[PDB]
C-alpha cells in the first residue's frame, strides 16, 4: 500500500492566486508597476548616494535607516521634478528618458497635479543645479520620528551645514531667494503626503494587485504604521 502517497497529499502546496482583475486597465497596471520597479532601482541608487553625503555616515545606522525610509518619496518626487524641468517642455513628467508621461496623453488627477507642481515650481524659481543639489540633500533630513534621532546633536549639525550650503549656492539681498527656495522645500511635505497616500492605497489594493519590488515593499510596510500613528515630525523652515 502506498504510504508515501498520503504523505505527498499532506505536503502538497495549496493553489495560489495571480492577483489578476481583467477590469483594471492594462495600460494603468503596466505604467504603475513599471514605475514601482524603477522606484526600486532608484531607491537602491539613493542608498548608495546618501552614504556618499559628507557627514551622513557619521549618524547612527538606525538614524541613516530612518531618514531614508521617511524621505524616499520626497527625494523621488524632487528628482522627478528636476528631470521634468530639464526636459524644457512644460507639463511633462520625465520618470525616465524612455518613460515620459506627456500630461495630455482622471484617476491620477490629484496625483499628477502634485508631481507636476514640483516641476512648475522649479521652472518658476529658475533653480540652478547647485541649488537643486543642496535642496535634495535637505529633503533627506526633512522628516524625523516624533520621538527623535539617536544622533540628534550630529543630525542637527549636519542639517545646518546643508542649509548653510544652500545659502552659499545663492550668494545682494538674495535672502528672499533663500526664503523662496526653503518655501518650495516646505511645500514638498504636502506633495509627499498626497503621493504616499496613493502609494499606500495601491500597495494594499488586492483588486488592482499592482506589483512592487522587495526594496519598496519593505519601506512601505515599515512606514504605513508610522504614517497612520502620525509618528512623523516634519521639520519646517517657515511656520505654516
Amino acid at each position: 500500500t502506498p504510504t508515501l502517497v498520503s504523505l505527498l497529499e499532506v505536503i502538497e502546496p495549496e493553489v495560489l492566486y495571480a492577483g489578476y482583475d481583467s477590469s483594471v486597465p492594462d495600460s494603468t497596471w503596466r505604467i504603475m508597476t513599471t514605475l514601482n520597479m524603477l522606484g526600486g532601482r532608484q531607491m537602491i541608487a539613493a542608498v548608495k548616494w546618501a552614504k556618499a553625503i559628507p557627514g551622513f555616515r557619521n549618524l547612527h545606522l538606525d538614524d541613516q535607516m530612518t531618514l531614508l525610509q521617511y524621505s524616499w518619496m520626497s527625494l523621488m518626487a524632487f528628482a522627478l521634478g528636476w528631470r521634468s524641468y530639464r526636459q524644457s517642455s512644460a507639463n511633462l513628467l520625465c520618470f525616465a528618458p524612455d518613460l515620459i508621461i506627456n500630461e495630455q496623453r482622471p484617476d491620477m488627477y490629484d496625483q499628477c497635479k502634485h508631481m507636476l507642481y514640483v516641476s512648475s515650481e522649479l521652472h518658476r524659481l529658475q533653480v540652478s543645479y547647485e541649488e537643486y543639489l543642496c535642496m535634495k540633500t535637505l529633503l533627506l533630513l526633512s522628516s524625523v520620528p516624533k520621538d527623535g534621532l539617536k544622533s540628534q546633536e550630529l543630525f542637527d549639525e549636519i542639517r545646518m551645514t546643508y542649509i548653510k550650503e544652500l545659502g552659499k549656492a545663492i550668494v545682494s539681498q538674495n535672502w528672499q531667494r533663500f526664503y523662496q527656495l526653503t518655501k518650495l522645500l516646505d511645500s514638498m511635505h504636502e506633495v509627499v503626503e498626497n503621493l504616499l497616500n496613493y502609494c499606500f492605497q495601491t500597495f494594499l489594493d488586492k483588486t488592482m494587485s499592482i506589483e512592487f519590488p522587495e526594496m519598496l515593499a519593505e519601506i512601505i510596510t515599515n512606514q504605513i504604521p508610522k504614517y497612520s500613528n502620525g509618528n512623523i515630525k516634519k521639520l519646517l523652515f517657515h511656520q505654516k
Binding site: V47, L61, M65, Q69
Partner: peptide, 9 residues
C-alpha cells in the same frame, strides 16, 4: 533588511 544590507556594504 534590504535597506540594512545596502547600508552595511
Amino acid at each position: 533588511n534590504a535597506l540594512l544590507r545596502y547600508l552595511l556594504d
